[PDB]
């Protein structure tokens, strides 16, 4: 049956492929392979051509993504050549390299060796391979919430973190055949960080609130052609509002409003005054002030969703199905003044794509 | 088929009906009533008991409402006894001086005789029994666009709108029997308005900006155990964000960003401003404050949201499934920082419920 899967999958992602490629000829002969090659290992293996078309549709078929309108030109880089846990971290760290790129940062997506019979070759435990830890004990929190669970997992692994708002968790993930992850420290050189100023309100520095220029997705599988690469960290740049709205605004994250709203100078009382709409706006702008002020790449959410309009149209240009979940691709703040709002979008799964594995930890 | 749709639906609701009114035993004896009537007569006439709670029902089951917490408290208007267009006319003007209570708004609903054979009695136009009409000609726009079509099939039944942008549209509906809709001007004292001031802001005003108390739906489809109240305009408060980030804020409907970004000192010049994010707030501060400072009721989006929560402990504790319309419940502003954004919600249609139909006009 898993042979039959993964053969049926094959048969669809490789027409698919190379048609988009215009190789439609050779789908033939490179099935019949693929036929041969999983009969006897009951498995196959991506030319890097269809490896790199495979993440770029993936990264196509991410219906909750409003960023997609750049899919074709995601960055693919093949580690699938990796045997060591060394080889596993460089490549980490490299990928944080070229994706940050000095802050013009490159969409990119490091492809480790797949999952053979669902076992692993390399499990990531880390949610982004750049994240703060969090810590909660006895009524302190300290750090991102989101990130406890994994940080306390860290400390079991001999990590300890200086338990400031900002500690940067280190890589951790396990090689097949381990028992145990490891974990190496990131260097504070590859990590590119934005202190949050606000363009017209000097007292917003007090907040010292800080981000990582890169968001880098580590933990997702991603599926090509009945392939399963389970470990494949990918990254693109942020939309503000995930930082002002969610990271930074959540109240089971950092939960700065309240502090936003003081130094901006109005009260936190009454609801009625929409001080947490006016704290988000203010939070929003300084984070989209800050990143470019940095020269570190991110886009406001309207502009994203023009870009993602674009890529709507591009789709039904080329006679391709557009798939979306509605409820991800609006922005978290005035979702209404975006097109996205005012429409509605077929949250059907298309492969190749990214899917949610089982966290290793917890 | 018909009167077994009818029979099924009403067996299901009424049993549901009584058990909540703690009537369960005479639940059979009003079946057989019910079966006989059905029976005799193609229909079944609803107690005043049964259709007061149909209709609370029905607002409790509306997915996409926000407001449903008071649901119990809905006052609800029989006039299925109503047989001419003054009766009509009348119940409408009474709905609308009950409702707006002098500001103190009343969740009201007015009850019209059912479709007997899916043939209207009374079929009522006005998408809210009051609304503003709106105008296109050769390029020039003029008040609400969304009231574009029915201001015109208003126009070719003799009225004519001043062609301000707060034209009232008059009360326009059809009686069985009659081939044309008849409309009433709407009498101006009974319609309440309020005039939109930002409480810190003094050029606010500059924009003239105005709207109505109290939003009275009126062209949807009230039904109870089988029965279809096609005609059953019902009204609760507004929620701020209503008008000031959709009907005042929308680009195909008011569309004044731009002139709030302008008389608040803003540029509305680069995205990355988020200057309609900033002008959606004061819009919708200004909206709050204004309808508070007249004595009209109002309610801003997060302690609608915090009575929502409520809503859904309610439910659960009543052992009621709660349903809900994700996209609808999630204001259209800073919608994750309401609970709603964080949870999902079963979108499944119960009944009783308020249904869409045909508009009679475009
Ligand atoms: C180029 C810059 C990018 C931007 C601005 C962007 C924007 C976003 C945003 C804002 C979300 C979450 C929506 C929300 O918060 O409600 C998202 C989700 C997602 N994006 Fe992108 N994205 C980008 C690049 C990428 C790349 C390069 C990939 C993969 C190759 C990708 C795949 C995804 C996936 C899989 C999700 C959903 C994750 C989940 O379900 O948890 N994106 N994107
Ligand atoms: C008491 C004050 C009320 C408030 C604040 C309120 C709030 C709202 C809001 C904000 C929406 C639309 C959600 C959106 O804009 O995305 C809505 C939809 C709705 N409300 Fe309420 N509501 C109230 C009373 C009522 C009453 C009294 C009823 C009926 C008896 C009702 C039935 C509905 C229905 C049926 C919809 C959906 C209409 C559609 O699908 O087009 N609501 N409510
Ligand atoms: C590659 C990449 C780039 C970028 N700029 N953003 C992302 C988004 C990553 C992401 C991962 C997860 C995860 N796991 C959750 C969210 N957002 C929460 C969205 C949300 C939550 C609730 C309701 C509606 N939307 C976002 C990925
Ligand atoms: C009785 C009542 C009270 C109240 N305060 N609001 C309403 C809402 C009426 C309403 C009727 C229709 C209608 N027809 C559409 C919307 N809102 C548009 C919501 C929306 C649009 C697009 C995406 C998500 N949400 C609202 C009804």
Redesign the interface.
């Given at each position: 049956e898993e042979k039959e899967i993964l053969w049926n999958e094959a048969k669809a992602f490789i027409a698919a492929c190379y048609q988009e490629l215009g190789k439609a000829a050779e789908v033939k002969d490179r099935l019949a392979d693929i036929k041969s090659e999983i009969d006897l290992t009951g498995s196959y293996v991506h030319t890097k051509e269809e490896l790199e078309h495979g993440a770029k549709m993936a990264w196509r078929n991410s219906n909750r993504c409003i960023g997609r309108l750049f899919w074709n030109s995601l960055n693919v880089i093949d580690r699938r050549d990796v045997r060591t846990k060394e080889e596993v971290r460089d490549a980490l760290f490299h990928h944080i390299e070229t994706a940050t790129n000095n802050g013009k940062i490159r969409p990119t997506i490091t492809i480790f060796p797949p999952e053979e019979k669902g076992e692993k070759q390399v499990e990531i435990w880390n949610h982004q391979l750049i994240r703060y830890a969090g810590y909660e004990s006895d009524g302190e929190r300290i750090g991102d919430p989101a990130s406890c669970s994994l940080t306390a997992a860290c400390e079991e692994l001999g990590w300890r973190g200086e338990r400031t708002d900002f500690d940067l968790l280190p890589l951790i993930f396990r090689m097949k055949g381990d028992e145990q992850p490891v974990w190496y420290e990131l260097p504070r050189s590859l990590v590119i960080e934005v202190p949050i100023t606000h363009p017209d309100i000097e007292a917003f520095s007090d907040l010292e609130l800080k981000w990582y220029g890169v968001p880098i997705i580590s933990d997702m599988k991603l599926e090509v052609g009945g392939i399963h690469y389970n470990a494949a960290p990918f990254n693109g740049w942020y939309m503000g509002t995930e930082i002002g709205?969610?990271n930074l605004?959540?109240e089971?994250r950092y939960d700065k409003?309240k502090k936003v709203a003081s130094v901006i100078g109005i009260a936190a009382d009454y609801?009625?005054?929409?001080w947490?709409?006016?704290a988000?706006?203010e939070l929003?702008?300084a984070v989209?002030?800050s990143y470019?002020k940095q020269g570190v790449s991110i886009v406001?959410h309207?502009?994203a969703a023009?870009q993602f309009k674009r890529f709507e149209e591009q789709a039904e240009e080329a006679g391709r199905k557009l798939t979306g979940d509605?409820?991800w691709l609006?922005p978290?703040?005035?979702?209404?003044?975006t097109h996205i709002?005012?429409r509605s979008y077929d949250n059907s799964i298309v492969k190749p794509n990214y899917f949610y594995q089982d966290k290793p930890y917890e």
């Open positions: 709205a969610r605004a959540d089971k409003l609801n009625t005054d929409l947490k709409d006016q988000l706006v929003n702008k989209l002030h470019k406001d309207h502009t023009s509605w409820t609006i978290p703040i005035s979702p209404a003044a709002f005012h």
